[PDB]
Amino acid sequence: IVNSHLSELDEDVFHHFGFTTKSFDFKEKFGDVKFVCVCGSSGRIHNFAISMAKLAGLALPVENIAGSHARFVLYKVDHILFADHGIGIPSTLILMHEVTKLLYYAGCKDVLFIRLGTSDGLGVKPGTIVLSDRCVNTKLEPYNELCILGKPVRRQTKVDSNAVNELKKLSENLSLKCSVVVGGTITANDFYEELGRLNGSICTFSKEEKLAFLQSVYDHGIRNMEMEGAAITSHCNLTGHRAILVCVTVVNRLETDEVTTSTDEFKLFEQLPGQLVGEYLKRNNGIIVR
Amino acid sequence: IVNSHLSELDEDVFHHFGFTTKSFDFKEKFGDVKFVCVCGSSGRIHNFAISMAKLAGLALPVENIAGSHARFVLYKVDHILFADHGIGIPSTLILMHEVTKLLYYAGCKDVLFIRLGTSDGLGVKPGTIVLSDRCVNTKLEPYNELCILGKPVRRQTKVDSNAVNELKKLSENLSLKCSVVVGGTITANDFYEELGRLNGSICTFSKEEKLAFLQSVYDHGIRNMEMEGAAITSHCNLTGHRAILVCVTVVNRLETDEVSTDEFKLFEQLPGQLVGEYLKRNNGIIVR
């Protein structure tokens, strides 16, 4: 389904990328894109892009395509786009609207979005990669909820189960220094109270209450929790694209709220999704290997 | 109301600032804080901190207190903290949790949070400063909704009406090149569909339907729309602090959907011109 209103526009402005439809020949510039890789940090996604450029053997430094005074960054390495989405569903939806419009104007069909994130784990050790087979909200329902013109709307979430399976199989043939698990993911709007953290500035529950909640979701098949998945996976489904989440876990919340703060091992954890995804991209014609 | 769990912890980590309760003596470093100014952008709040430091005649370094690789920046000049909140309620709630904890460990009581931002206008000309007299959701209810351990929770929003009146009176005494109006503010969770924009990647409504929704909002006293207000005002209320929004409007959505580079930057400076003078006249900065 296509937004019929876009045909009504003579020029369209990407407010959060700092460019318009007059800035490029979108079809020429982006027409070959088949993957969009995203996470919450501009520095981290820039580093993954650089890392993909190295894999592709690409000699030109990776530079921002978005305007430098704009909110979000955008990089391109061969048939892959890279962008940040900031923290949370509202920020992410802005990015989803603007990138999926870009893809539309460029004629890109059936693109795979890959969120490479960090996440809280449940019942897996820190450093585990979780491939989302399912994304649910804090009510454990597979929907993203919105309120549009004041009326409640629910949009079903969906992940690319074929891609999940391919990544699972790839991980078995790689030698990654971690475990890879297929399981469900909770998206929340609050890093603290909605994820059952006891150490916000406000907390209306006990340790037992938090544990009862998290154990129940574990036994529902949830293995991690983050803040954007609902949004990405519901949005792609409606705009005709595919989505997966590939997130490393940085704490086992069934045991603690605190991340064992080895500054080295957190950066270690952060690299794991890219190692797996980079190879998937290389094996699925995301890049030219120079 | 205090979070009792905090006293159980030995070292508490501010994940999004990149420091801990061990990094500093919080009472000595932050104990004099009575104001926290926030907006969406690190660059924008940085430049406002430098402007306040200039206004105060503070010659000392105004460096980022947060870790250079942390999610948010944090600056201080005299009795004011400065930090960015990103876009949207969830990002802003993280900032609100970590800053209000910081104030808690520092012994700061009854602090005024001030959001300086941009916003969609309803029936006011672009460049208008709206001082929020209430913050509501897209159903026009003065609450921020959460789902905590799977249970719906509704947290009332509140603004510091007295501070709103003082800014209004100050605007009448200053010569700012804008109008200043007191009126209501919608917080939404989506820049496009939830604010009735027709040019998202998805849209299930007509121009007439979004106009009816916005006209209704206006009829109920709403004069602008943005994406964080519900979060700041509900949170300050529960933690014993006060909050206000001072937002310039950059488009009149009742007339047009489209907001050039020149005039927008001029718009952005306007909340800072009014607030900076308010802070100068209400003991935010010492007279030196």
Curated annotation (Swiss-Prot), chain A:
PANTHER family: FI09636P-RELATED, URIDINE PHOSPHORYLASE
One GO process term, biological-process aspect: nucleoside metabolic process
Taxonomy, superkingdom: Eukaryota
UniProt source species: Schistosoma mansoni
Record's subunit section: Homodimer.
UniProt name for this protein: Inactive uridine phosphorylase B
Example of a GO MF term: identical protein binding
One Gene Ontology term, aspect cellular component: cytosol
Protein family per UniProt: Belongs to the PNP/UDP phosphorylase family.
Swiss-Prot record, chain B:
GO CC terms of this entry: cytosol
GO MF annotation, one: catalytic activity
Pfam families per UniProt: PNP_UDP_1
Signal peptide annotation: none
Biological process (GO), any one: nucleoside metabolic process
Top-level division of the source organism's lineage: Eukaryota
Assembly, per entry: Homodimer.
Family statement drawn from the similarity comment of this UniProt entry: Belongs to the PNP/UDP phosphorylase family.
Protein name as annotated: Inactive uridine phosphorylase B
